[PDB]
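queue> holo job accepted (zinc ion)
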Amino acid sequence: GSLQPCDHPRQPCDSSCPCVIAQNFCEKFCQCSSECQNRFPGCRCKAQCNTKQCPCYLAVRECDPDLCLTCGAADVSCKNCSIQRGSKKHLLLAPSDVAGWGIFIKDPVQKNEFISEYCGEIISQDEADRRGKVYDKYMCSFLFNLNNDFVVDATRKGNKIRFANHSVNPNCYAKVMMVNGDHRIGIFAKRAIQTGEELFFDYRYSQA
Ligand SMILES: [Zn+2]
Ligand SMILES: [Zn+2]
Ligand SMILES: [Zn+2]
Ligand SMILES: [Zn+2]
Ligand SMILES: [Zn+2]
Ligand SMILES: [Zn+2]
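queue> job finished
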């Protein structure tokens, strides 16, 4: 059960806690003490927080304003707070070099660098399969597979990066990240990308 808070009033998060059994950190939604030993401790980085040297970056979570007290998360020296702050690289929507409409990056990025949140509704494959066969009011829809269980629907609540085209050889990928207790989708560069290049995702399975 993904994102299930534990709730065992007056009891600690021991080997009887579902979070501990399933081997996941206790999160913001869990009813346990803020001092719970099964919670994520955050980081004490000096800045950046964009390499495996950062505990938060490594655990696929953004830094936490009330836990990451040195890196800049509580203040833009921390580069692991972008989804929270609504920060992103500059992107251009333009006619694709391939065909139709495309997204072109306007800032250079390095391999594994954050580009933008991919906004939308995270839904199950079941809910996606429904929307797919059922009569819909929206004409032009935007959806891709995160993995084999979940899809992002960017039709109603998407942002500009939803216009990025499909490729089985993509230059970008998606991370499902823990962001202040919620799962949010980050788009990262799969390789170094120069300014003016078109961005591509693998729609089959974007979570690389
Ligand atoms: Zn617990
Ligand atoms: Zn818990
Ligand atoms: Zn706990
Ligand atoms: Zn850090
Ligand atoms: Zn941190
Ligand atoms: Zn940080």
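queue> The chain has one domain: 1-208.
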